[PDB]
Amino acid sequence: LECGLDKNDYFLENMSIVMNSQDAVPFLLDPSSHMITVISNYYGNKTVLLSFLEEGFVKRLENAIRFGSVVIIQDGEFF
């Protein structure tokens, strides 16, 4: 909540679902990209933002995987 998650019971359950289980990659759908900042506040410096549309996507994620970066991919429709 401190990061800026909405008070709604629905949005609490949602964030629980996202975090608590990670044995699988979570897919976050939200029109208001307020959620892209929430995860950023949680991981801070470790947070590296990418997008399936940007050019250097292919290599930038490989850098992210090698040195433990927390990655969020901005355009999941295109994959």
Partner 1 sequence: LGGCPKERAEISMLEGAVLDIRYGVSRIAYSKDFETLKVDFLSKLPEMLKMFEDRLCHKTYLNGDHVTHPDFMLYDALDVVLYMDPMCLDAFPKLVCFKKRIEAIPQIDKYLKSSKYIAWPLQGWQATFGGGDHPPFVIEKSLNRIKKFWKEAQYEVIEHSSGLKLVREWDVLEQACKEDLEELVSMKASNYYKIFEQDCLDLESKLTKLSEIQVNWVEVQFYWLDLYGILGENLDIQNFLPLETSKFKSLTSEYKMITTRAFQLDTTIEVIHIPNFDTTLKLTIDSLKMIKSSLSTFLERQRRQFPRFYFLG
Stretch that binds partner 1, among 9-17, 18-26, 28-36, 41-49 (CB under 8 A): 41-49
Q: Residue 5: which region, alpha, beta or left (left: phi > 0; alpha: psi -120 to 50)?
A: beta
Helix, coil or strand: residue 50: strand
Out of 45, 77, 78, 79, which residue is the one contacting partner 1 (CB under 8 A)?
45
How far apart, in Å, are the Cα atoms of 10 and each of 14, 24, 45, 76? 6, 21, 28, 22
Site mask for partner 1 (CB under 8 A), range 48-67, x = bound: x-------x--xx--xx-xx
What are the residues binding partner 1 (CB under 8 A)? 45-46, 48, 56, 59-60, 63-64, 66-69
